[PDB]
Amino acid sequence: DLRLHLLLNTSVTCNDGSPAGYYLKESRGSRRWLLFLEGGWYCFNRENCDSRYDTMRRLMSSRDWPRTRTGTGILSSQPEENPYWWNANMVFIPYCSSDVWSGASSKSEKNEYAFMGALIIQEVVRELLGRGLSGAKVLLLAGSSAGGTGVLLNVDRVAEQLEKLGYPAIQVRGLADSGWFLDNKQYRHTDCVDTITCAPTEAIRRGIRYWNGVVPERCRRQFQEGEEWNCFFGYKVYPTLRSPVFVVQWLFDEAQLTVDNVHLTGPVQEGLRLYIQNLGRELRHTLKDVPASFAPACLSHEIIIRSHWTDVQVKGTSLPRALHCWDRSLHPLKGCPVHLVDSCPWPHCNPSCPT
Ligand SMILES: *[C@@H]1O[C@H](CO)[C@@H](O)[C@H](O)[C@H]1NC(C)=O
Ligand SMILES: OCc1cn(-c2ccc(Cl)cc2)nn1
């Protein structure tokens, strides 16, 4: 179990002004630290944030959080469940800012909600340095879904923060799971006039304004004002980064298909067959020059904190093994690969896909 700590700096808050926080399980014999970012979509105006507050309030507030949480998958402390980092110090950071971890705005007489995701990460790092993180050799910033995108947006800022604080020896790295999206054409079109129909590019453009969103400096300097939404898309922001980042991405991610207005129920036809095959090929193409990556040909969503994350394989190598091979490479290795991308072109052409 991981134990809840609410942030001592009460100005760093969830959407509704309640304190943000983190769940921690220490491993005093270890100098490895894993900080995991939860996911769960986002909201981008008053009306759709109000809806989220009625029926998704744990993603908006800490007032009902439980005192503990069980570590699962890569957050498990049992070697049978977590062959990769079972002995590390474990941290789970709840997603309560609805801003893809990019916001830097407080609640005020001008703002009904606070959007502080980027500041929550920095405050968690600061308060952990007093609880053992000061002695770390590696800090791995991981996350799933919106948390995976959050890794891409924040990993270099964590690195810069520790450097300026006097800790140049801590190696910051990132692990982005199911957060690598494409700004592609939808299979069927919908005009952005309310939430249902509003494509990611437009929703994120409005979000950055609503959230006072922050993106990495180098990417911001390339795309410039009004175009920072580009930095929320992995294939555009990744080349600007400097911290080592391992990318885990299903070729046919269910959230990607949702934003593309694809609904698979049933006998496809030719038009949709070609659309799905082209999506797989495009994703594959964006990963061609990503040296640490794991991309199976499955229709699924998230993986690294699922209890059965050990079961999927690409070219005979599991995800925990590929992550271990990555660790070795950061000290090619014979029989210990780090770049693993399926080539077959249809969902579940890989027999190890989740059922
Ligand atoms: C609390 O957090 C805010 C927002 O990041 C920051 O400006 C302030 O300096 C912090 N205060 C302390 C005492 O850490
Ligand atoms: O949990 C599903 C999910 C998807 N997203 C998301 C994030 C960024 C972009 Cl650019 C598109 C989609 N966030 N959460």
State residue 127 phi and psi, 5-degree precision.
-70, -25
Cβ count within 10 A of residue 224: 9
96 in Cβ contact with 62 (< 8 Å): yes
Estimate the crossing angle of helix 146-164 against helix 117-129, to 10 degrees.
50
> Contact, 145 vs 302, CB < 8 A?
yes
Q: Can you say whether the dihedral through the CA atoms of 185, 246, 177, 345 is positive or negative? A: positive
Half-sphere exposure (CA, 13 Å, Cβ side) for 306? 16
Pairing of β 138-144 and β 32-37: parallel
Task: For residue 263, count other CB atoms closer than 10 A to its CB.
Answer: 11
Q: Which of 156, 177, 253, 260 is catalytic?
A: 253
Please answer whether residues 305 and 322 qualify as being in contact, where contact means their C-beta atoms are separated by less than 8 angstroms.
Answer: no
Instruction: Return the SS3 of 140.
Output: strand
Annotated resolution, angstroms:
1.5
Q: Would you call 310 helix, strand, or coil by DSSP?
A: coil
Active site residue 342: no
DSSP-assigned letters across all residues of 326-346: HHHHT---TT--SEEE----S
- Residues contacting residue 262 through CB under 8 Å, at least 6 positions apart: 187, 272, 275, 276
Strands 138-144 and 89-93, by their bridges, are unpaired
Q: Using CB atoms within 10 Å of the CB of residue 317, give its burial: 0 to 12 exposed, 13 to 18 middle, 19+ buried.
A: middle
Closest ligand to residue 260's CA: 2
- Strand 245-248 and strand 171-177: the pairing is parallel
Name the catalytic one among 61, 102, 145, 300: 145
DSSP assignment of 67-96: SEE---GGG---TTT-TTTTTSEEEEE---
Rounded distance between C-alpha atoms, residue 246 and residue 233, angstroms: 15
Tokens describing residue 1: 């179990």
What is the residue type of 51? S
Chain centre to alpha carbon of residue 5? 22
Give the C-alpha distances (Å, rounded to integers) separating 103 from 73, 154, 182, 316.
28, 11, 22, 40
Distance, CA 123 to ligand 1 centroid (Å)? 8
Establish whether 253 is a catalytic residue. yes
**Beta bridge pairs of residue 5:** 22
